[PDB]
Amino acid sequence: WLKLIFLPSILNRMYFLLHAEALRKRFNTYLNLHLLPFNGTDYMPRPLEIDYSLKRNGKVKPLLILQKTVSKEHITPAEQGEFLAAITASSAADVFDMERLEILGNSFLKLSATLYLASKYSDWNEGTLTEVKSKLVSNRNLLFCLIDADIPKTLNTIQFTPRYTWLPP
Amino acid sequence: DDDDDNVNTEEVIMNFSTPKVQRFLMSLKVSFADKDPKDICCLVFVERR
Amino acid sequence: TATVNKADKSKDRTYKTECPLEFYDALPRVGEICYAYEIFLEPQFESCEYTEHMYLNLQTPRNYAILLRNKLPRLAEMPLFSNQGKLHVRVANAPLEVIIQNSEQLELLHQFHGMVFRDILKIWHPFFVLDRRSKENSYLVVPLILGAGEQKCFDWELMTNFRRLPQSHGSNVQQREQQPAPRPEDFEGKIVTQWYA
Amino acid sequence: KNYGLQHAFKMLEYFKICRADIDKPLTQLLNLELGGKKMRANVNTTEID
């Protein structure tokens, strides 16, 4: 009885854990990184980590992201828990959310859109480049280009209230 | 009797009411024990305003 | 190009949610191989006089698994927070492969699975119905017991006994006179409730 | 965070945010060219100095 008390939470978490695993395998396959020993059949998913930052919980140090960008020896496997955190929205009152990854993702998206536009339309004034960049990274464009990827059907965005708004398997 | 006020309120209510009210509360509890608030919709008819 | 849709910045859309591919069509079938993944709950809190009961109970080998026709991938360890501390939950990587050769056996399995939510957790709703369509989000939860050796087997006696939770009824003196004397053994490690209170 | 910018650039091709081209693959965005008529690479350095 005591073990079964926790069953709804475990089932709800395994739902989105399987969703995140599917996303992880799909993205690793798209980048041809699925054949790596880390991401192959020998993948050991690391345990989920609590985000304690959440409210309800001389010399320059080299930057890690660039260091693994220029060298493949420091490429780390894309964690399943990280993908679950990306899926889980803040509205779902879970122990992790999507905001911290969203900051880095938004900055990278802005940088990449800027570089792409500057390389594609180097003969434009900065007003139109800024306008086009704002349109590209706008909420509507991201919404549409994620809806056409069948991602929003697997998001975790509602609070878990099993007795009220949940359908058991 | 005790210090737990949450059960003290129920105990004093059940001890300071006529059997009509006590039986009414017991029926209300056994009819809507752990149900969904969206699923229950009931009326209570009494005489005086 | 249009600027009409720039005003409603706080819009939202309705999306048809889809279960993970493993959960879809995961209803175990008669005569087909099925996989059960035991769920292990590991208490992290230190045992004390107030956390003794959970810390001893959750380490018992009488765990429950999840039955699927599909094979689950390796799952990350998950943390859970009870009132008396943090919990670590892991799903066994190697599934338990068993065969179902009887129709009423599967019926009993699904009956127990439905009973758990209907009575033990009280997630049931009047319009809820046991699902046999073998479609989205269809899998069972089965209790496990120790058999021969380290291998585990289904708790057939529990689900053949607990099709529904017995209703709590009080016993008066006259009918308590001839009732058998209570024994310590049938009262050890069980679930009891106060019908008089 | 897991695969660096070179591998992350392919996501924008996957999400169709940035349309790819034969001349300029998406993985070479770090090779940005300050191109166009706005440069004059034949100017000797004394004019700049």
Two structure tokens written together for A94: 């879970």
The closest of C136, D2, D14, C65 to A85, measured between CA atoms, is D2
Q: Which of A116, A126, A144 best probes binding to D when mutated, by most D CB atoms within 10 angstroms? A: A116
Helices (H), C23-155: 52-57, 103-115
How far, in Å, CA of C52 to CA of A83, rounded? Answer: 36
- For this PDB entry, the determination method is cryo-EM
How far, in Å, CA of C62 to CA of C145, rounded? Answer: 5
Listed in sequence order, the residues at least 6 apart from D7 whose beta carbon sits closer than 8 Å to its beta carbon are A31, A33
CB-closest option in A31, A122, A142 to D36: A122
The reported resolution of this PDB entry, expressed in Å, is 3.2
- Tokens 């398997």 -> residue: A169
List CB contacts (< 8 A) between B38 and chain A: 164
Task: Name the strand (E) or helix (H) holding C160.
Answer: helix C156-161
The closest of C81, C79, C89, C80 to C37, measured between CA atoms, is C89
| B1 touching chain C per CB within 8 A | no
Which of C135-168 are b and which e, b meaning 16 or more Cβ less than 10 Å from the residue's Cβ?
ebbbbbbbbbeeeeeeebebbeeebeebeeeeee
Contact A137, A110 (CB under 8 A): yes
Using a 10 angstrom Cβ sphere, with 0-12 exposed, 13-18 middle and 19 or more buried, the burial of residue A94 is buried
| A31 touching chain D per CB within 8 A | yes
First to last CA, chain C: 70
CB contact under 8 A, A31 and D10: yes
How far, in Å, CA of A161 to CA of A93, rounded? Answer: 10
Contact A84, A48 (CB under 8 A): yes
CB contact under 8 A, C58 and A48: no
Contact C178, C130 (CB under 8 A): no
| B35: nearest CA partner in chain A | A163
Contact C86, C142 (CB under 8 A): no
Contact C112, C163 (CB under 8 A): yes
The closest of A78, A83, A92, A86 to A12, measured between CA atoms, is A92
| C119: nearest CA partner in chain B | B34
| A113: nearest CA partner in chain D | D18
| A118 touching chain D per CB within 8 A | yes
Tell me the CB-side half-sphere exposure of residue A121, using CA atoms within 13 A: 15
List CB contacts (< 8 A) between A163 and chain B: 34, 36
CB contact under 8 A, A163 and C141: no
Length in residues, chain C:
197
Q: Are A and D close enough to touch, i.e. 3+ CB pairs under 8 angstroms?
A: yes
| Chain D positions touching chain A (beta carbons under 8 Å) | 1-12, 14-18, 21, 24, 26, 29-30, 32-38
How far, in Å, CA of C60 to CA of C62, rounded? Answer: 5
Angle between helices A126-136 and A99-120 (to 10 degrees): 140
Other Cβ atoms closer than 10 A to D37: 7
Contact A15, C19 (CB under 8 A): yes
DSSP-derived secondary structure for C72-88: PPP---EEEEETTEEEE
Task: Name the strand (E) or helix (H) holding C141.
Answer: strand C140-146
Two structure tokens written together for D45: 């350095």
What's B4-38 look like in SS3? CHHHHHHHHHHHCCCHHHHHHHHHHHHHCCCCCCC
Q: Are C and A close enough to touch, i.e. 3+ CB pairs under 8 angstroms?
A: yes
How far, in Å, CA of A32 to CA of B23, rounded? Answer: 70
CB contact under 8 A, A3 and C41: yes
Helices (H), chain D: 4-14, 45-48
Q: Which of C6, C16, C19 best probes binding to A when mutated, by most A CB atoms within 10 angstroms? A: C19
How far, in Å, CA of C176 to CA of C81, rounded? Answer: 42
3-class secondary-structure state, position D36: coil
Which of A136-169 are b and which e, b meaning 16 or more Cβ less than 10 Å from the residue's Cβ?
bbeeebeeebeeeeeeeebbbeeebebeeeeebb
Q: Are C and D close enough to touch, i.e. 3+ CB pairs under 8 angstroms?
A: no
Which residue type is seen at C140?
L
Two structure tokens written together for D15: 């999400």
List CB contacts (< 8 A) between C193 and chain B: none
Contact A160, A88 (CB under 8 A): no
Contact C114, C162 (CB under 8 A): no
| Angle formed at CA C125 by CA A94 and CA C37, multiple of 5 degrees | 55
Q: Are B and A close enough to touch, i.e. 3+ CB pairs under 8 angstroms?
A: yes
Two structure tokens written together for A92: 């779902």
CB contact under 8 A, D1 and A120: no
What's chain A look like in SS3? CHHHHCHHHHHHHHHHHHHHHHHHHHHHHHCCCCCCCCCCCCCCCCCCCCCCCCCCCCCCCCCHHHHHHHCHHHCCCCCHHHHHHHHECCCCCCCCCCHHHHHHHHHHHHHHHHHHHHHHCCCCCHHHHHHHHHHHCCHHHHHHHHHCCCCHHHCECCCCCHHHHCCCC
Two structure tokens written together for C34: 């099925």
Contact A85, A19 (CB under 8 A): no
The closest of C41, C38, C40 to C54, measured between CA atoms, is C41
